[PDB]
Each structure stands twice: as C-alpha cells, then as structure tokens.
C-alpha cells in the first residue's frame, strides 16, 4: 500500500500549493500595468542578412561583446558570424551534423554544439595553431541534446532529452551534478544573470527552477497545456517567460510562483520555438512557427509588432547584451539582424 | 576598408568557398532513414560497401554515396524535424509476427504494433512526399511458422489459403500498403532473408525511381 499511501500525500501537497498560490495573488499584471502608455508599433527592418548557410538553422547564440554570433545548422557547420560586417570569422566543422544547440562562452573562447548523438562538444577558438579544435567531448546523456549554456569557461549546464539536466566540469569531463525531476523530455534551459539559478521546461508542460550549487529543484511552474519548446529569463532575475507549443507564451514570476500574463491570440495556431527578452524587459521577442517573429509587450500583454520576412519557421532568437539588436534564424538557412 | 578589414573579407570569402565546396559535395549524397524493430540488423549493406548511427554505403561506383541514419530512444516528435529532406524512408518489419507476443504483459500482437507505427510514419506531416521503402524480413522463418507455429492469428480476412504461404504475403502487402492513401508515395516492398544478396539493389532501384518521380513532379511533365 506504499503507492496508495504516498499518492494521497502527494495530492494533498499539490492541492495545498495550489491554494497557497491562489491566495498569494492579490491581482494580476494587467490590473497594475493597465495605466501605462502603449509601447507603440515597434517595427524593425532587416539591417543585415547573414546568408551563408545551406540546411536549416536550429539555434543561435550571441556573445558578450554584442558583435559575434554563432549559428548551428544541420549541414554540419558552426559559423561564427561577425554581425557588424556580415563576415565569417570561423566555420567550425561538426563530427555529427545533427545539432540543436549552440552556446557562446562569456569570454568568447569556447563554442558548444550538441544534438542527437547525446554528446556536447566544447570547441576551442583561441589556439596557438590558428584552428578551432575540440577540447572535451562531454558524454553521459542517454538522450538527445536540447540546450547548452556556459556558466563560465569551465562549467556548462546542459539539458537533454533523458528527462535530465546536468552541470558538467569540462577539465575533468565528469557530470559534477545531475538533475532529476522532469517527467518528460527537457527541451530548453535558461540561465539567470547570476550563474546561480537556471530554469528548464520539458514536454510535460512544466517549468522547473534548479539551483546549480546544490542540485535540487526549488520550484515547479505549471499551467501550460502542451510542450514547452523555449524558455528565457528576465534581466532582473525574478521572472522568466515560457514558450509553449499551444501558441501561448507566459510570464511565470519566480517569487510569486505563479503566472502573471499569458500572451495568446486567436489568430495564432502554430507554436513558439524560441523566446528572448529585451534589455529593458518591455518587449518579449517570441519566434512563432508561422514564418513570424511576433513582438509581445511584456507588461500590457498586448501586441507590439511583427517581424515577418522569413520563408520557413523561426527557430532561434537573440537580443544582444546591450539590447541593440534582435537576431533571428529560421529554417531557410538565413539569419537576419533587426534593429 | 583598412588592411585588417580587407584581409578579414578575404578570409570570409575563402570560408564561403569551402562551404560551397562541401555543399556541392553533399547534395550528391542521399539520405535514407531507417526505422522499425525486430529485423533491423542489416549489416549486409555495410559489409558490401566496406544515438544516431550513420552507416554510409557506396553503390554504382562513385555515382551514389548513400547515408543511412538510425533511430534513437527518446520522444519521437522533436527528433523528426531533422529528417524532413530524406530522399527515402526504410521501414523494417518482421514477418515472424504472424504468431506474435508482446514484450509487455498485454501479449496482443507485434505486426499490429508495426502496422500502427507504419500508419503513424506514413501519415506524418513531415513525410508527405517521401517514399517508404519496405523490407519485409524473416522470409524463411515465416515460411516455416505459417505451417508450424500458427495460421492467421488476426484472421479478419487474413490468409484464406493459409497453407499457400503466398496469400499470407499478399495480405500482409495489402495491409501495409493500405495505410498509404495518396498517389505521391510509392511503398516499395521486397521480401528478404539472411541468405540473400539482392538487398541493396532494391534500395538503389527505389532511390532512382523516387528521384525521377520527384524531378517529374517538380517539373510539369507528370
């Protein structure tokens, strides 16, 4: 009767948490942000088109300098573009041309790639030989890779499809910390702007906070009806926005442990592939599958603009460290840097 | 444009040239996905030629250099976008499921599960114009079992001439091809066994037929 005894306790705990969350909501985001001027029609143009790819673009990451952005494509090449000149600094070859992630280290010395081979490869950029070579292939996952983010030059936080996330130590190659608690395939992870907390969203329609220092979950965020295909983090580090597959993004507050606003429209029937915020936090750049890059206002829960221009679906977004530009990569082997 | 900028532009152009060289040397190759369980141990093609387990081949001198791509062990809805441009799909089914038992406690069927997987793959939105080469393996084993083991376990109409050992094959073909309701997909099929050699020639023929059909469809001739 162990299963029967424990399930009642689990249901009681879940009901108590739900009741506490309901009682801890005096109002909503709209009730306090309805007195502010509308953001206005934020329309941006294609300043540059980083057109050098062949197959679909699956992910993209900027750098700390707001100049270099890496692009991962199933053709097998990790091109380190130069945004201000549309150049190609590097063309990193890949062992297996099945890549869904790319991370650019804060120091700009390492590029990460990973995919269906369950292996995250750390690529060294600054070498005395002038070529970019692997430094440490991180292995131990039993499933496909979904998102890798660099904590520092030595640690990489990796979320895979084996219902697990992981913290890796590159120098030794060992999984220093393993993360468990997801009842489904983890699809995207985001790192808080203090390298202390990181949130992940799996196919179980749940978003989970994790503390990389210890290795245990802190909060579980639910409310979505379908898979979470993207996740971001507010610049102030107390909120995070969840991209789903039911056409609705959300703003899950951290301290409040609830959802503040849902950005859903009757017209949209596709899903959200990537979600990225702006520097001020006013704009929630969401990349939908219907060849669009809809710009959602993040306080009024209202439309702000459309960044159409992509033939296929948008699969990666990025707003620079200084918030100057928003880059968009789609499955048409194209990259556009709006402003 | 200073000296550094001009040299960077030259490096970028060389990178573009190398990317084009790899792209034109990758279009020649043809991708062939490989799903199915029970009779997927196809080492014959690798021997003749020489997560994801790619097994490249070499057929028709250097004209055709195919690439096989195996399966995985996670959710099959986020790993499928990658294989949208495959020029063919290989589905392997074990004919020894006429008298089949499930791995779990249900013990219902194995070909029926294979049939459901086939229906899901055929009707998948991504593979809407990708031919499904079918390799019905375990030929001699079925030729023995349809006498010894059982006879038409499912029997909706299956195997009227059960002992004929050919009406069973015809009904299996009909059941597996009925899941393909469109004229844009050709479900090639070929029985094979361990002691066989014409196992990659059929793949080559199906690939050629698919290529010419796609060329015609992209054109207006047919």
């Amino acid at each position, epitope marked *: 009767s162990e299963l029967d005894q424990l399930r009642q306790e689990a249901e009681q705990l879940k009901n108590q948490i739900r009741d506490a969350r309901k009682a801890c909501a005096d109002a909503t985001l709209s009730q306090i942000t309805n007195n502010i001027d509308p953001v206005g029609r934020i329309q941006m143009r294609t300043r540059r088109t980083l057109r050098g790819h062949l197959a679909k673009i699956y992910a993209m990451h900027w750098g700390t300098d707001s100049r270099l952005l890496v692009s991962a494509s199933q053709d097998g090449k990790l091109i380190i573009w130069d945004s201000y000149t549309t150049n190609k600094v590097h063309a990193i070859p890949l062992r297996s041309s099945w890549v869904m992630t790319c991370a650019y280290a804060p120091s700009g010395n390492y590029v990460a790639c990973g995919g269906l081979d369950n292996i995250c490869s750390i690529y060294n950029l600054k070498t005395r*030989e*002038g070529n970019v070579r692997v430094s440490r292939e991180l292995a131990g996952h039993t499933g496909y890779l979904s998102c890798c983010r660099f904590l520092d030059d030595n640690q990489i936080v990796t979320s895979s499809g084996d219902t697990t996330c992981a913290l890796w130590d590159i120098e030794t190659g060992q999984q220093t910390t393993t993360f468990t608690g997801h009842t489904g395939d983890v699809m995207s992870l985001s790192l808080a702007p203090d390298t202390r907390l990181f949130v992940s969203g799996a196919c179980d329609a749940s978003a989970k906070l994790w503390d990389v220092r210890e290795g245990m979950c802190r909060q579980t965020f639910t409310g979505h009806e379908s898979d979470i295909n993207a996740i971001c983090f507010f610049p102030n580090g107390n909120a995070f926005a969840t991209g789903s597959d039911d056409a609705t993004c959300r703003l899950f507050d951290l301290r409040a442990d609830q959802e503040l606003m849902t950005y859903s429209h009757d017209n949209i029937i596709c899903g959200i592939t990537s979600v990225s915020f702006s520097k001020s936090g006013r704009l929630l750049l969401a990349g939908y599958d219907d060849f669009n890059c809809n710009v959602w206002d993040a306080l009024k829960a209202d439309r702000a603009g459309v960044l159409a221009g992509h033939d296929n679906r948008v699969s990666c977004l990025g707003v620079t460290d200084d918030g100057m530009a928003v880059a968009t990569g789609s499955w048409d082997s194209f990259l556009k840097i709006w402003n | 444009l200073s*000296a550094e*900028d*001009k*040299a960077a532009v*030259e*490096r970028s152009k*060389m990178i573009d040239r190398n990317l084009r060289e790899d792209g034109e040397k990758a279009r020649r190759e043809l991708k062939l996905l490989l799903l199915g369980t029970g009779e997927s141990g196809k080492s014959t093609f690798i021997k003749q030629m020489r997560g994801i387990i790619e097994y490249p081949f070499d057929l028709q001198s250097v004209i055709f250099r195919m690439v096989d791509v195996g399966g995985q062990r996670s959710e099959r809805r986020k790993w499928i976008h990658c294989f949208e441009n495959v020029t063919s799909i290989m589905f392997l089914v074990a004919l020894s499921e006429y008298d089949q038992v499930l791995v779990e406690s249900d013990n219902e069927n194995r070909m029926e599960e294979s049939k459901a997987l086939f229906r899901t793959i055929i009707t998948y939105p991504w593979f809407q114009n990708s031919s499904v080469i079918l390799f019905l393996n375990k030929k001699d084993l079925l030729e023995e079992k349809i006498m010894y083991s059982h006879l038409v376990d499912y029997f909706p109409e299956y195997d009227g001439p059960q002992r004929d050992a050919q009406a069973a094959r015809e009904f299996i073909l009909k059941m597996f091809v009925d899941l393909n309701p469109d004229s844009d997909k050709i479900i090639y099929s070929h029985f094979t066994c361990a002691t066989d050699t014409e196992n990659i020639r059929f793949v080559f023929a199906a690939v050629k037929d698919t290529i010419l059909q796609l060329n015609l469809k992209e054109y207006n001739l047919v």
Partner: single-chain antibody
Framework: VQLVESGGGLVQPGGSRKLSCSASGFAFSSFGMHWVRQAPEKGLEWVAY????????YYADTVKGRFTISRDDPKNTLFLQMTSLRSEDTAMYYC??????????????WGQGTTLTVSAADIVMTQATSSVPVTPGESVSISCRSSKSLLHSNGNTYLYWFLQRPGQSPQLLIY???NLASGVPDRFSGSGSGTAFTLTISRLEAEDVGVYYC?????????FGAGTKLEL
C-alpha cells in the same frame, strides 16, 4: 609552433638567392606570412607579405619588384627569391606570421631569423628617443609619433609594439595599441591619441631589456620605427 628560416650565407654584390622558411606547428593555409629585416646596428624594415590563398601580395617600396615571395601550402614552406642583390640589403631576415579576423593578433610569432651579408608618402613613424636608462623594478614609458592619424572609421586604432631582447627574435607585446598579446605580463599597457602613443611599463625587470619597435598597420606600407634602447 616554430618557424625556422635558413638558406642564406654570403652573396656577391650582384648575385641572387632564395630564402627558405620551414614552418611546423599550425595551419599554414589560414595564416598569412610577412617578411621583416633588420640591418646590423639599425632598425626593423618591412619587406613583403603574402595572404591566405596567395590572393594579395605586397612589397616594400625600397625593394619593389626586385623581390618575389611565394607560398607553398602543401610543403608548409615560404620562399623569397632575391633578385639584383645590393650591398645595402644586408640584414637579418625574419618570418612573421599573421592572421586577420575580428579580435585577431597579427604578428604574434617571429622566427629565429636568417643572416645575409653582401660585400660592397608613407606613414614614417618618428622615434626621437634613442636610449633610456631604467632601473630594474621601476616604471618606464616609451613613445613614438605617427605622421598620419591611425584611427580608421571602423573604430580600431592600429599600432603594434614589439620587443627584441638582445640576441633573440622579436616578440609581440601589444597589438592595436590597447590589447595585450598572449604570453606577455599584464604590466604592459598602451594608450594615446591617433597620432601620439605611449607604453607604460609598470615593474621593469631583466626580461624587459631590449629595443621597443612601434608599427603602423593601416596602409600597406607597414612602416616600422627606429626603436628605443633600454639600459639598466
């Protein structure tokens, strides 16, 4: 990473020779290669450069035409076939590697060098100072002046500082007048306007004794400087 160059002894006034530079330790194809010479009791002087893919080749004005430089990628060797040799070209010829991308470090390696003795509108950088006596463990500043502003519209100011310890190949201290190359201690620091430059060495030691050469890299005439002697 090593670039040893050899193939030069003594040439008659009027002869010709070819200089060989065998490279092993990196990728030659992606790396451009320069050529820098220094006459005895004199300063560094630019000779030629060849880019990746043998696309762009430049030569110094004083040796224009009389020199030819070729790249041999398969054998990883550089050549310089000297023609119409004179007695004023006697110097020590170096192999300098360079790669150019965003954040690159041009002139980040210099070979041992080869000796060759022959019997009998550029941006000319100004180095008024010749020698400076500096104690080991005290700060010292070295300055050189440029005729033309060294600040392109790209926002990057181009000036390279070099160090030649006695009897050793030159090393790269600071590239683009603000960035410190690998293998150099943090004491070195460069600053200044688009015409006047400085270099604030913090704690000078026995390893900081040599001649400091400042370099201009905006035009192709990559004019170097006379240099500054450092004494204990």
């Amino acid at each position: 990473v090593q670039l040893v160059e050899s193939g030069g002894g003594l040439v008659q006034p009027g002869g010709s020779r070819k200089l060989s530079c065998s490279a092993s330790g990196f990728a030659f194809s992606s790396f451009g290669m320069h050529w820098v010479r220094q006459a005895p009791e004199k300063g560094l002087e630019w000779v030629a450069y060849i880019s990746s893919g043998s696309g762009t080749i430049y030569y110094a004005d004083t040796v224009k035409g009389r020199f030819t430089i070729s790249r041999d990628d398969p054998k990883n060797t550089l050549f310089l076939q000297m023609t119409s040799l004179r007695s004023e070209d006697t110097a020590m010829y170096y192999c300098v590697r360079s790669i150019y991308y965003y954040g690159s470090s041009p002139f980040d390696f210099w070979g041992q060098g080869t000796t060759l003795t022959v019997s009998a509108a550029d941006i000319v950088m100004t180095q008024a100072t010749s020698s400076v006596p500096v104690t080991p463990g005290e700060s010292v500043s070295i300055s050189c002046r440029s005729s033309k502003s060294l600040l392109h519209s790209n926002g990057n100011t181009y000036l390279y500082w070099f160090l030649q310890r006695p009897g050793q190949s030159p090393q790269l201290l600071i590239y683009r007048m603000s960035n410190l190359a690998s293998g150099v201690p943090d004491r070195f620091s460069g600053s200044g306007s688009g015409t006047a430059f400085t270099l604030t060495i913090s704690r000078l030691e026995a390893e900081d004794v040599g001649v400091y050469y400042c370099m201009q890299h905006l035009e192709y005439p990559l004019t170097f400087g006379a240099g500054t002697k450092l004494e204990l």
